Amino acid sequence: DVEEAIVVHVADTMRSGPSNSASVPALTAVETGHTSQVTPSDTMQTRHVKNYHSRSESTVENFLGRSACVYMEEYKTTDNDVNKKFVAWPINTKQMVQMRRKLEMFTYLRFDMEVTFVITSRQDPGTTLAQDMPVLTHQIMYVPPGGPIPAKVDDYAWQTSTNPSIFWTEGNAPARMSIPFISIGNAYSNFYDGWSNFDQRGSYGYNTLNNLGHIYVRHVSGSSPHPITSTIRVYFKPKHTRAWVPRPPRLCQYKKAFSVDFTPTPITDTRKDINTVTT
Amino acid sequence: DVEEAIVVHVADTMRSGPSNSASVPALTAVETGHTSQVTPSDTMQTRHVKNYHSRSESTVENFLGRSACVYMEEYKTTDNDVNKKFVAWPINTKQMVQMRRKLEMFTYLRFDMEVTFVITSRQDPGTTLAQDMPVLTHQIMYVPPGGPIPAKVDDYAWQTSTNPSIFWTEGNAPARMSIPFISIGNAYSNFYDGWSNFDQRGSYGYNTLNNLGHIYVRHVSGSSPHPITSTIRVYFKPKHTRAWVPRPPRLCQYKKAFSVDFTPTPITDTRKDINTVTT
Amino acid sequence: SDRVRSITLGNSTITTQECANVVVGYGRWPTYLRDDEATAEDQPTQPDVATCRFYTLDSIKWEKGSVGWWWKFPEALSDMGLFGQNMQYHYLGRAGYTIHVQCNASKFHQGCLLVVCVPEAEMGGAVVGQAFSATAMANGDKAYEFTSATQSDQTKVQTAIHNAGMGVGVGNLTIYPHQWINLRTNNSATIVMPYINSVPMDNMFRHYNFTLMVIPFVKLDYADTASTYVPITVTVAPMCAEYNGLRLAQA
Amino acid sequence: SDRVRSITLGNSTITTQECANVVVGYGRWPTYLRDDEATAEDQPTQPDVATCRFYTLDSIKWEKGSVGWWWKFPEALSDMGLFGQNMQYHYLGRAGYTIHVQCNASKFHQGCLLVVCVPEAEMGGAVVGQAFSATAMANGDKAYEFTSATQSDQTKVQTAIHNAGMGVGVGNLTIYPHQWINLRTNNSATIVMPYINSVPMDNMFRHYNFTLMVIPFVKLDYADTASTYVPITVTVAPMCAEYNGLRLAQA
Amino acid sequence: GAQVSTQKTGAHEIIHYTNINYYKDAASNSANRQDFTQDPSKFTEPVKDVMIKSLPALN
Amino acid sequence: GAQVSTQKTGAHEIIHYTNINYYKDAASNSANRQDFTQDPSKFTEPVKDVMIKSLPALN
Amino acid sequence: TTDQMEMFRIPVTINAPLQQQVFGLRLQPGLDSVFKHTLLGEILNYYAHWSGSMKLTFVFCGSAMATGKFLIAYSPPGANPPKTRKDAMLGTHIIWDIGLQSSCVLCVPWISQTHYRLVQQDEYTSAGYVTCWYQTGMIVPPGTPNSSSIMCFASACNDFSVRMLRDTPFISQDNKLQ
Ligand SMILES: CCCCCCCCCCCCCCCC(=O)O
Ligand SMILES: CCCCCCCCCCCCCCCC(=O)O
Ligand SMILES: CCCCCCCCCCCCCC(=O)O
């Protein structure tokens, strides 16, 4: 009622002696699609070894359970261009290369998400910088698909009555939250080999299934006499992860944020000849 | 279930009276390599004394359980030289003399580590200093051996998806973390009397076994109109310590960070003559 | 009487009639590697009597002006019997040692020697910085001599005796397993060293497990005799040796 | 299927996919010397995996005009791994052997080889009387060739094939442990030889325990192919080897 | 309402830690990074008929 | 899940303190600076045959 | 190699000297160009330490009438890699006989002084070499091609494990993707 109470280790090595028999563990046939399960004990004399190594750090939960940057953008407190005083990002995971490649090792994923925001500000250079400005405040707004979108820093849409938002003041700890599994399907799909229209026309690829919404950011009411620039960084961290259908890691460099397009690349590096073994 | 429940004192002195016998506790032979175990009770009359002194503060856990500085470096928010806007330190414990000597009293050590970072900033002098700058933010990145290394303050490598990192804002408590025992061998080695190549050639000494990685630091996005300099200090604190094979403390001053090289030093100070006992 | 000792390893025997006790490492006797600490998988080879036997390591002269000598192991035995062959042909090795130092003189001589085994005796160069080859401190069974004055040649180690070539007070070497040869009382010294390292096994050519040092604290003296020098001899016997990782020879 | 065999000695393995049965000496498997048959008193050394392993004994070409070859053991392994070192350093030795001969060819070739181990294969000189040195019949792992015509050089053995160099009918060698390599059916031959001698142990340099002979009874033939010769390879592995009487090396 | 479970070993080896949930949504919980079950047969042995390692593969 | 153990004496001598672990890794625990066992025989008495202090050493 | 697919096939010929080397390579699964981009090297490159044994599987893709024997050997770390078959055969090896079974497995044992090895292997944590030599030679009947190919497969055993996550150096960007 008050307190409820809730290791694997790799396989050991068994002692093996001399052998002379008709069994041939070493000989197999890869044509069957079967990976051989032989062990050193089956082809040479071995001693008894008790291993205590564990594969704890290789689990998908730990492999994908690290915060990684997915987007950064800059916005200014005051400027002549209205569009440059706030950000508007359509959520996707293909913008940054490292986390993209980590994710695309699997075809389908299902996880909760933990989002962290890091915001920093700096004064823009100019001929006159002497001013006194109190601490700034920022708003992060999440708009599910189909909702109204703000067109300027002081629009009515920023008065969220149903859209979740966060107000954060500089100098404190970074903002953070949790997000559940918000896919319409039974799992997220990194790849989609299909079209949007039923007659095989229109958009092609993963771009068709990206309908996660938008994120907007602004200075709440800060408007300094001299311009100030702020940068926001978004970090994603999967939780409670499950993965299906592994696929080989990518070899070619990425070139588009919403396409698989690539340039052909050599399989690997070369060496002097097939016998060269020295440095 | 809710509550589970978890002194030594030095030896006492026993009363001793007059003696006249064939036993000779005082006479021994150092040639055997044996340190005599005589006590004052064995050579003079003594009273009974009950000691309550304990050797609690002499344990290796307490001896090595103090935070000590191991490295400091400076980096500027803005400058013409790219290499001077961030730090890159190959982790080692030989940089600072005091903790180095404390550690080298033992040959092998095994412990967890607690790392604390102290960061301070100051404005550089100049002909014009009037500016307004919000609070700065810093990033500390740890790159295990073989990982990519950033070449500039705004490189792609800073988007860590798997390398651990910390983001810290000025004015708060210093950053801190815990590190487990990350050696490939069964214990850390302060000394290594051997070579790198099998034919006794190449690097010699402890330098061969130092493969702990690197630490990188930068200002996240701060770039002030006028230069600002920041200094970082790294403190190490062993935990759960175990030590083997004690060795004599060093006598000569240190001269290299990755070598035992030294200059010969006198055994000790001198005095007027072998009978001088006055000040 | 407890002043007589006899040691039998393999097909060789050592007898001493005037000696002190025996020092056993850090209280641990040499032993084979256990199943729950090994890491290498293939079967080890244990030559036993073929390798675990006493080898005599050449001889040196003790003069009135001697300052000291050192030997590095297992390099000192690198070309000695089948122990050297097993060292050459195998990738990994592991063994304890028994060290016996002989030095005898009449009742009218005087002098004292310190015999000590130093694990991981890393040494510094004569000139700060620079570097030296693996010939300034180990060239087989030959003994290397300390120096009274500070070393100046950049191609060799700093041989200043009072620092022991390690930057430490020579008087504090008592912390390691050690014994004294005082001519008034004994003529031999015996030390049993277990295998000490941070890993279960190691390559015997790349790494020096420990260093043996003999240092005269009280210099030799005598008067009106025909004996001009006192020879010193060193004998070593590997114990519980085992090897792993057969390959082409050389190393 | 019984046409597949696998043999594991030490850190080496042999696999054959088209082979005949295995012949075991005279029905006896190799074994260590017992306490009630030994004569030497000191402890033996048993390197085990370090010496009991397969060694590949160089290779030869089978031509249409080949007549035969022989190897003398244990001289053939005198300089092979740690087996050679133990042979050099010890006075006495004792070991059984596993002999594997490889020879493979297509289904369109024809030929037959006799593989036989001859204990105490004493040979006669080319010229009656006279004498020959220990180089006319054993110079390491190199193979020696029989001759179709009668030998004439006085410095070498009588190599007439039809007498097998022993004064006996070549067709009667079937009495010794043997096997055939017939290209229609098999591509290997395996023989396990126990230690056979009139004394419990013997010096491995002075005495040739047995001789291996390979003789083409039906000469090789083929037509319209780019393969001009059929290589033959010999592999040998000592079994249950033990040594005695350590001394200075060489022998 | 408090769970007690063992924590991963470390150097020098009460190896117990306590956890309590504060939020009403299961998505708010901390990562469950202590499950270590695995089974590679789905990718290494996808064949229909069981293959014995000691026996020959094809016939 | 709470350990209760005595704390070191001090001036004027409930000498009990409570500890709870919050993290899943044993490396995160606090220092175990309350073990006071020691044995100097490994360095002071490394000889093979036991020596009696009252008896003469050599013979 | 003007054709990329030629990288996967190891040439073999009917007439060769009695002892000849087929191929040789360093056993650095996470660093060597041979193993760098394989399905095992890619996984290793996300980690810093590794340990355990490995499997190398070789498959003969010649004609059904071709035959031969090969010696495949693993030489633990040392000052000199083997230069001849006589040297190679002193280490761990297997004699491979080509027949109805097209594949043979060389299991590389875990022989090391430390429990773990660095992925960015240096001289301290060397792992050895692997080489293949002709044992008997390749023989063919009339009416068959004079050359054949072999392929190699690499995988880990059931005692393999990794440690210390890190970022892979194979992928990088210079600008934000759009
Ligand atoms: C292929 C990637 C699928 C992963 C699913 C990502 C869904 C994004 C959910 C969070 C988006 C909004 C975050 C801001 C919320 C807030 O600040 O109000
Ligand atoms: C001889 C000294 C051995 C002690 C082992 C020291 C290993 C260093 C481990 C910590 C290095 C990285 C610390 C920064 C981590 C972080 O900020 O991400
Ligand atoms: C919103 C929940 C706040 C919980 C605060 C910490 C726990 C206080 C009560 C002590 C633990 C007992 C919990 C329980 O009875 O299950």
Ligand SMILES: CCCCCCCCCCCCCC(=O)O
């Ligand atoms: C992550 C764990 C947070 C624990 C918070 C403090 C403890 C609250 C519960 C009161 C103590 C009871 C603990 C127990 O039942 O073992």
